């Protein structure tokens, strides 16, 4: 629904190497458009969408410069974190960051995001007021006090309200040809044996974009989600995505059931039933 930008950043330390592995990935409307990786031949922010090619060389040197700053910031934080959690040297550890902003259909700031994780667990997050912080444990409380003192919240607030939103407009305008596209799901139903007098009906949705989609079964026209196996939406690898829902019904009474598929690319939802 709401347009969005995100920067997903990761730092991984490792035994032997003094420099940790840093990777930053940028998303516009959940579609990857830029990437930085420290282990690349010539580390810089690369375009990963065809519509980003039109940015000038000056744009890319600014972004690469910020990546270098973040590498240094992540390195220092990984070291502090190691001390906070009383961990031994020579190990391997992860520091993750999610930054970004949501826009309303009216094209302005809806919600701002800024949150960190350590070893894949929540560490600290900027609150929705963009003023206060939520620390997951005692380690993160030490970071909180330090950041409260320095006015770190204000800094990120100016980013999420300022440049995050301003630059999202430019990216949305430049690449609306590809971003606002919608490929409709081509759907069907398969029938498979499960046990004595019971059958698995599976509802397929294939070749759809964007990933947002809802599949539900129903009994006699009434929504049915009791014990519905619903798989994780997965990429086809050609731009589009795939998904299925399934339900276990009695043998002979399969006609009673129908699948329902909702997707923004359709003029109206698909209703399907397994036929011989």
């Amino acid at each position: 629904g709401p347009h969005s930008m995100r920067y997903f950043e990761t730092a991984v330390s490792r035994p032997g190497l003094e420099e940790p592995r840093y990777i930053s990935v940028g998303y516009v409307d959940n579609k990857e458009f830029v990437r930085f990786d420290s282990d690349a031949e010539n580390p810089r922010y690369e375009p990963r969408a065809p519509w980003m090619e039109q940015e000038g060389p000056e744009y890319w040197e600014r972004e690469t410069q910020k990546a270098k700053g973040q590498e240094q910031w992540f390195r220092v934080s990984l070291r502090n974190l190691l001390g906070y959690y009383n961990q031994s040297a020579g190990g391997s550890h992860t520091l993750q960051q999610m930054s970004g902003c949501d826009l309303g259909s009216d094209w302005r700031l809806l919600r701002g995001y800024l949150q960190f994780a350590y070893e894949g667990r929540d560490y600290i997050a900027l609150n929705e007021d963009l003023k206060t912080w939520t620390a997951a444990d005692m380690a993160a409380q030490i970071t909180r006090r330090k950041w409260e003192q320095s006015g770190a919240a204000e800094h990120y607030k100016a980013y999420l309200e300022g440049e995050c939103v301003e630059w999202l407009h430019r990216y949305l305008k430049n690449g609306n040809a590809t971003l606002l596209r919608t490929d409709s799901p081509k759907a069907h139903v398969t029938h498979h044996p499960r046990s004595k007098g019971e059958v698995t009906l599976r509802c397929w949705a294939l070749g759809f974009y964007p990933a947002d989609i809802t599949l539900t079964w129903q009994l006699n026209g009434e929504e049915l989600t009791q014990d519905m196996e619903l798989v994780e939406t997965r990429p086809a690898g050609d731009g589009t995505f795939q998904k299925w829902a399934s339900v276990v019904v009695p043998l002979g009474k399969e006609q009673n059931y129908t699948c329902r598929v909702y997707h923004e690319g359709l003029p109206e939802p698909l209703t399907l039933r397994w036929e011989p």
């Binding site: 920067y7 930053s24 940028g26 830029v34 930085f36 922010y45 972004e63 910020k66 990546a67 700053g69 973040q70 910031w73 220092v76 934080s77 502090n80 974190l81 906070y84 520091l95 960051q97 930054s99 800024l114 960190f116 560490y123 600290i124 970071t143 330090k146 950041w147 003192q149 320095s150 006015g151 770190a152 800094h155 990120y156 980013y159 440049e163 995050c164 301003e166 630059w167």
Partner: peptide, 9 residues
Amino acid sequence: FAPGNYXAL
């Protein structure tokens, strides 16, 4: 346009 962090954890 990526962010620039200000104060380490």
